């Protein structure tokens, strides 16, 4: 099938200039024109504007007309956006779409960019467990940055009752906990363990929840 | 230059209801043949999805649920029945001349009210030993959204160091999360003996609160 996979998260100091791709399979390549979007937290969408491969011609909206520079290979089969001059304000997600012959529709996009710009230094968390009918569990996650992080419990078993809620920047370090609810039976007669993952320390660290 | 003005902003509708979304046009977007509006959901950490191509046309692999409609300057997203899933924000899309999107709709879920399930959690261990000492507290599975968290120590109410973060609606039962963390030094935890987070929410006329004395281990 048609995919678009795009690069991993970015952290880059202000005044910098950074270079995502969106890499595409399952179609020929040079066919299709590729756009790009910026999505700033629990905003909308904004236009960026578009590459079209088979020529390598480009348009911008207005607002990213000094700011962005889209370009292709078409032998990777891949388009990049490089974003220059780089301040905060620039710190988003940002989504390549595929626009279809069919009505201009955009029906094949990226899972997204996720760029931090930031002059803070990447810190790994420290991981703590949360020990105390459903029992409720805890892991807090603090001290950590840039995002992401990623937590599971029993790597993905328990997925059902958790809730991992969004991390909270303090003092220049995000900090957030998980909780998970499992019937009193379960637990503690069979092991609950959160594992973190900090892909930007290279971090993968289990706690098992063990009572007090 | 065309200008597309989305309503509402927000929409609140029972499961089982009908949503409609609205999205209008300065000018017409079907002068040339077809009407060149698209509609789009999308959920939180997720990629937009295509719904609705050309005004009318469902797209593949998404329920016959969700409908579009209008032509020229009009045009309409309709959602029925709507789902829990349906929570979500809702986007309109026109290309042509300049590519513009919608302020797009939010739209929510109503269901029962529902208390929070509170639990409360002391420091860990490993965390005194590096001379903090945070104090947990989850407010889960409830409804409405709007919820109040106090802390208090030694029955009086502390304010500094305190960090919240809300959930999303959830997909599955339309219900809200809600984490409170209290952060001091070990040195200061270890100095008081009882630590509370109460909740002020709409379904009781007194806040649920969970308390414990650091002294029972
Ligand atoms: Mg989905
Ligand atoms: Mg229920
Ligand atoms: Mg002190």
């Known amino acids: 099938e048609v995919k678009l996979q795009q690069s991993g998260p970015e952290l880059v100091k202000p005044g910098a200039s950074v270079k995502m791709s969106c890499k595409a399979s399952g179609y020929t390549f040079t066919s299709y024109v590729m756009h790009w979007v910026k999505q700033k937290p629990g905003q909308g969408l904004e236009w960026i504007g578009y590459?079209?491969?088979?020529?390598?011609?480009?348009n911008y909206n207005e607002k990213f007309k000094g700011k962005a520079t889209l370009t292709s290979d078409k032998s990777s089969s891949t388009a990049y956006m490089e974003l220059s001059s780089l301040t905060s304000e620039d710190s988003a997600v940002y989504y390549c779409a595929r626009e279809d012959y069919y009505g201009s529709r955009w029906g094949y996009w990226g899972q997204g960019t996720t760029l931090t710009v930031s002059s803070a230094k990447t810190t790994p968390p420290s991981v703590y467990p949360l020990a105390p009918s459903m029992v409720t569990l805890g892991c807090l996650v603090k001290g950590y940055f840039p995002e992401p992080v990623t937590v599971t419990w029993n790597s993905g078993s328990l997925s059902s009752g958790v809730h991992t809620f969004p991390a909270v920047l303090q003092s220049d370090l995000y900090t957030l906990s998980s909780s998970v609810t499992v019937p009193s039976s379960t637990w503690p007669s069979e092991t609950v363990t959160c594992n973190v993952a900090h892909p930007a320390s290279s971090t993968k660290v289990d706690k098992k929840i063990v009572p007090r | 230059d065309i200008v597309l003005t989305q309503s509402p902003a927000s929409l609140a509708v029972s499961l089982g209801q009908r949503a409609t979304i609205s999205c209008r046009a300065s000018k017409s977007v079907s002068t040339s043949g077809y009407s060149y509006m698209h509609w789009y959901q999308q959920k939180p950490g997720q990629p937009p999805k295509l719904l609705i191509y050309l005004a009318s046309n469902l797209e593949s692999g998404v329920p016959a649920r969700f409908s579009g409609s209008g032509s020229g300057t009009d045009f309409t997203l309709n959602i029925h029945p709507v789902e829990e899933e349906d929570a979500a924000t809702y986007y309109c899309?026109?290309?042509?001349?300049?590519?513009?999107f919608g302020a797009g709709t939010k739209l929510e879920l109503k269901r029962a009210d529902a208390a929070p399930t509170v639990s409360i959690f002391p420091p860990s261990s490993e965390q005194l030993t590096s001379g903090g000492a945070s104090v947990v507290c989850f407010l889960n599975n409830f409804y409405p959204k709007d919820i109040n968290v106090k802390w208090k120590i030694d029955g009086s109410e502390r304010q500094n160091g305190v960090l919240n973060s809300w959930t999303d609606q959830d997909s599955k039962d339309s219900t809200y999360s809600m984490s409170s963390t209290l952060t001091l030094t070990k040195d200061e935890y270890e100095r008081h003996n009882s630590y509370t987070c109460e909740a002020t929410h709409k379904t009781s006329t007194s806040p649920i609160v969970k308390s414990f004395n650091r002294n029972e281990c």
């Open positions: 590459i079209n491969p088979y020529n390598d011609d480009t």
């Open positions: 899309q026109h290309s042509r001349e300049l590519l513009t």
